[PDB]
Design a protein around this ligand. Structure first.
Ligand SMILES: NC(=O)c1cccc(CCN(CCC[C@H](N)C(=O)O)C[C@H]2O[C@@H](n3cnc4c(N)ncnc43)[C@H](O)[C@@H]2O)c1
Ligand SMILES: NC(=O)c1cccc(CCN(CCC[C@H](N)C(=O)O)C[C@H]2O[C@@H](n3cnc4c(N)ncnc43)[C@H](O)[C@@H]2O)c1
Ligand SMILES: NC(=O)c1cccc(CCN(CCC[C@H](N)C(=O)O)C[C@H]2O[C@@H](n3cnc4c(N)ncnc43)[C@H](O)[C@@H]2O)c1
Ligand SMILES: NC(=O)c1cccc(CCN(CCC[C@H](N)C(=O)O)C[C@H]2O[C@@H](n3cnc4c(N)ncnc43)[C@H](O)[C@@H]2O)c1
Lengths: 269, 244, 267, 243
């Protein structure tokens, strides 16, 4: 189609998985969302980083292992977490995305430049280190780069990992879940990776039915904050903290109505 | 081949095809006789060789124009309109619509009201900006298309374009009535396999809105054709209005 | 709370159950919704739909249970042609009293005869209004308290497994969230035979409805949430319709209504 | 009684200690990371406390502290005037200094706040002129923590109070509110006070009806001890006054 519906959605109503293997360009995605001055995208990124900073450095969400689900090609969402977690596992469905991440982990000269984001977080954190040291500390924290599929009851396949203290997921489950029972199942699937009492940290868009990568359109599940809270509690978690902001992406990039952050814990049997 | 289609999809005797036809007849009865879809001119698009989709409509439209891509299909229509002995036997279908209508009428009266209402039998192509070519027609109250556009459009942009082309035959505020297959990529006539656009309901909604219509009513049923004839997963019916 | 939020919702965010005993006035509700207008058009569509379901589509059997009847009976008129026995239910005792008055043809009851005449016209004028009303009155065997949020929605009252469960404009008002809604559909499933029919009609994307100046909570679901909830509850949808007609702005903020017919799955 | 309140609510590893730390972290975020800043902040229902102005004084040149109770204001002024009978806020002052990067130590922070507070006034949020006859220039930000729940006997009064507060604000100025959710009472020693048990949706409806657009809204589940209040969590919001 030609913008009539999201790519890979004509038959099913929702962007198929294969669309993320064929048409998700990580370089274009990074160029569009993480790369002029005080744009909507810039403001959203600052708010995300401030929240991750507050969750991981001021609120002391911490432990041995953190798993980042649906990382895409980005690493901004780990910069503060690596201060509180000894080991980070990064995951995405897209092999293209895993490639971009591993290039950045190798500090390949062709990889995306996160320096401005890194400097921002370092300044949030008090300027105790400069950018380079913060980047290398994250590179060292990232122990595994893995394929994942949230809709599967073992989201990482037969890949054995110790139970994690935290699962983080930014801007992923909306794009990954074609309906609210799938969403809830995905949250339950993520639960299989968590220690009892582990932390679930989700950031995503509210009421977004698509997002753009340039002229390429991808489905989003348009959930309100009540639907998100419902799904999280049904999936077996208790919510400690739940926030909404009005700031939205530019219309040329998504039709979201704000974003949410939440911190939850996996309940008892 | 028009008769082969009639034999396979409108055979009589229970069957998935019987059930689909009955639900088609009941939705059109609802649209044209209980609901307020009426007017002076109705145009049916992609009629093929069939008349079942006109049985309730002729109760509400003074004049009807039947169109299709295949002249061979239109010859088959005309055999029934001229009541040739070999023409397809639609009386069990005429009977079932009459009973839906309260047996207000009997078969023969129903068949003659349809023959009188059908005023023109035209060649058409939904992908052209003028779907009827240089044949002029007054602006129509209603355009009707059953099981046509999925077969006619090889992709979703064409589908949207077709809906706009059809709109050019429609007054502002006129009715668009469409019934078609959902998620069907092929349908069979004998062992001849034809292509279909396998679109879901969200894509239909998106195409209709984008072509300049607002949807009044949209229904989907789960009943499909049997495996030997099409791989659809249900059917939709919708009634839309042409925006200004 | 002075309209700022629905009555009974200030603490929880959703109209409490007790509010339906205190503040839901049957006669006011009937005057407001069931007396052209957006409300009349909606009623006409509901009646044409119930006509198609029970008379043309052959949805039929021994026992139908109507859930959340309120004080109304329009939703049973076509049904009593296809069902030997009808059981009506509502959470509100005031509603049940209004129904009992109409069932005994109390002279002070609400007059359904124009609605009755309309349905007799839909059905072919085979009979006139009075005969049809008396067929319905004889068909209604029980009037029962119900609470859709409890796993036995009719409590300990024994009934044979029903052939159909009908629910018009109720579940939205009754369920404060998606999980209660899906659980309520499961509860309703307990009253149905396997392969039994579930027929729901309700508003789309409605967060409140008005009776005069009284504001009641509604659960604002879209068509995909509804389809998802029904399927998780153990049903398979046979047909699902949406219409764009909504209540006038002073009554509710809905964006259309839906109708569906479903069947309780094999186990 | 203002000193009993202070000893009970703001003196180690308890539900109250947890709530206070959440309040300070959110105040720090709003005023030092989010860039809520300007000329004049008006603190509404301050009681005898100052913790809620520690971060704010970094971003506003002038602060006005207000309360319904004269006793509360005299307790507060005892701290502004560095009287020896004042509550010792130093553990709290230290925590905020630690939140801000230890750019300063306490005594500097303490002095920064004392010269920012320009007036100590009476206020009643239910009156259309909450500060009575005292004229103030239009404020950039109105801050109220744990006040409105205690002050309003019902939701319409809650909403009216929020409009009254807006009469002090410039159009496009900030409203910053933190309060209890679903609390009907709170305890000061043996003495029981009444609270409006608002849910979060009621808070949002009241705020928008009073003529603000909400930029962010956060709820936390953490509650006071049962011996203190029967709240079920807390909320924070930052809203803008519409024109
Ligand atoms: N909702 C929106 O409107 C919306 C608005 C703006 C931006 C985005 C980004 C959407 N995008 C994620 C950004 C990545 C990074 N964490 C970040 O914060 O920027 C979607 C990601 O989800 C993965 N994904 C797909 N299906 C998956 C599956 N079944 N199992 C596991 N993973 C899956 C895709 O690989 C892709 O990395 C969505
Ligand atoms: N999708 C399916 O799974 C599917 C399932 C079951 C059956 C069918 C048959 C589809 N077929 C017949 C329907 C006829 C009649 N209205 C009826 O309800 O039976 C489609 C008709 O559409 C015409 N047509 C082609 N291209 C055209 C064009 N460009 N411009 C205008 N017209 C065009 C063909 O001549 C043919 O008459 C498809
Ligand atoms: N969604 C809307 O915007 C909306 C818009 C317009 C009108 C309405 C009416 C909503 N209202 C009346 C429908 C009555 C009748 N069947 C009819 O179609 O008119 C809902 C009925 O649901 C009952 N009910 C409450 N809680 C219950 C419980 N826990 N268990 C069982 N039952 C319960 C109430 O007593 C009330 O009779 C809602
Ligand atoms: N809700 C709860 O469960 C709850 C839980 C725990 C604690 C509290 C305390 C409630 N109480 C103290 C907050 C003080 C300080 N800002 C702080 O964050 O500690 C509220 C203050 O609000 C003032 N106040 C009353 N009516 C007023 C009016 N009409 N106009 C203006 N002002 C008014 C009273 O003088 C009192 O100082 C309530």
């Amino acid at each position: 189609s030609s913008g009539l519906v999201p790519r890979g959605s004509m038959e099913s109503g929702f962007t198929s998985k294969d669309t993320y293997l064929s048409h998700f360009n990580p370089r274009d995605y990074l160029e569009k969302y993480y790369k002029s001055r005080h744009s909507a995208e810039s403001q959203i990124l600052k708010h995300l980083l401030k929240n991750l900073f507050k969750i991981f450095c001021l609120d002391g969400v911490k432990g041995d292992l953190l798993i980042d689900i649906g990382s895409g090609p980005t690493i901004y969402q780990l910069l503060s977490a690596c201060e509180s977690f000894k080991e980070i596992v990064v995951t995405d469905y897209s092999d293209q995305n895993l490639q971009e991440l591993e290039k950045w982990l190798k500090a390949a000269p062709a990889a995306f430049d996160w320096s401005p984001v890194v400097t921002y977080v370092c300044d949030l954190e008090g300027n105790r280190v400069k950018g380079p040291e913060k980047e290398e500390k994250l590179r060292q924290a990232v122990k595994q780069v893995l394929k994942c599929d949230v809709t599967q009851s073992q989201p990482l396949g037969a890949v054995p990992l110790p139970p994690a203290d935290c699962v983080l997921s930014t801007l992923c489950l909306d794009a990954a879940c074609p309906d609210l029972p799938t969403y809830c199942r995905a949250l339950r699937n993520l639960g299989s990776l968590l220690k009892p009492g582990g932390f679930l940290v989700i950031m995503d868009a509210l009421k977004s039915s698509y997002y753009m990568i340039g002229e390429q359109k991808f489905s989003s599940l348009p959930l309100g904050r009540e639907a998100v809270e419902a799904a999280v509690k049904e999936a077996g978690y208790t919510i400690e903290w739940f926030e909404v902001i009005s700031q939205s992406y530019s219309s040329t990039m998504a039709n979201n109505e704000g974003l949410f952050s939440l911190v939850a814990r996996k309940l008892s049997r």
